[PDB]
Amino acid sequence: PMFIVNTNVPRASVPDGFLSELTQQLAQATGKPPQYIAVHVVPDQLMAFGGSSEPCALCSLHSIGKIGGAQNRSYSKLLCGLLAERLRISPDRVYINYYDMNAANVGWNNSTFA
Amino acid sequence: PMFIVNTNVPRASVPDGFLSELTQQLAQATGKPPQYIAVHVVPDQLMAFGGSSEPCALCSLHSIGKIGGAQNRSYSKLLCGLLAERLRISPDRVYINYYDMNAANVGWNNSTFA
Amino acid sequence: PMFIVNTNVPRASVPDGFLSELTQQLAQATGKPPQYIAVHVVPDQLMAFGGSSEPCALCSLHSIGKIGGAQNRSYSKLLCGLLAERLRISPDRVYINYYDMNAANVGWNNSTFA
């Protein structure tokens, strides 16, 4: 899976080890080995949420499987939780888009996962 | 809804008030309350369009509903017009990707919109 | 088509001419005239892949048509090869997400392609 966080929080406010923590927690939450987890954190962004430039985040989680109604509620609780604790972003200023990819539409290592 | 603009126009050429103007215009166009609209503008990017690095933009608009053939034409007229007037990007050097998201695939405030 | 490369390789490691080379190679690979191809390269990113911060890339290719099982395998070989040769990223540290877009969901020049 792939997890992307775009935020207007400054780079200095992102803890060291945040990328490793995300990797570990996503591995547990999705049941995927950590070897397959990619995480991308984009701070210092020009963003507004509801008209306001208070801290906010726009996120995406792409996976082959492990996406659905109930799992996505679980992931939202986990990820809003981590962003609130570590980046000090309110969970009502977070959107997370979930994408269930087909394996033929994910390239890796000169081929696809199909 | 969420609206993301990626452009090679420098940060200095992005006018004051632009993120608020986009929030207001998108609220008018989509009917959604401004409180739920998120905007993200990414200047200074390394981009080319048709082989040339003249000003250009790559955009996306995600919404739960209010996406479809006729609506998307209207959004394109609106957004290309704003980009041309405020950032001086020609409309024929803009692509906008539209995504109709299922409510169960959008996380917000520790849950999803399902 | 649109091709986006996010990577933790530094800006100075991106060779001169790379955006044009991507444009040319995607035109040949997809069969689309180069006037339609847009490319966006984002270096210097905070990223991890498999828990490691070694060079990696997260990419996406969006097209109207020309997306599918066998075509995506060919694209992956071409694009992993380019990233390996030009940015010295190992192909097993690259993910490429492929998106087949409907013409009604792509805006351009004040309308859509529908």
Ligand SMILES: O=C(O)/C(O)=C\c1ccc(O)cc1
């Ligand atoms: O657009 C909406 O219905 C909404 O209120 C929020 C929203 C947020 C993110 C997204 O990708 C789609 C919709």
Ligand SMILES: O=C(O)C(=O)Cc1ccc(O)cc1
């Ligand atoms: O999670 C997996 O199974 C993967 O094969 C890895 C993967 C899934 C979805 C992506 O967009 C990127 C990588």
Ligand SMILES: O=C(O)C(=O)Cc1ccc(O)cc1
């Ligand atoms: O690929 C084509 O046919 C285009 O006309 C250009 C295009 C296709 C898909 C996109 O998401 C953006 C641009």
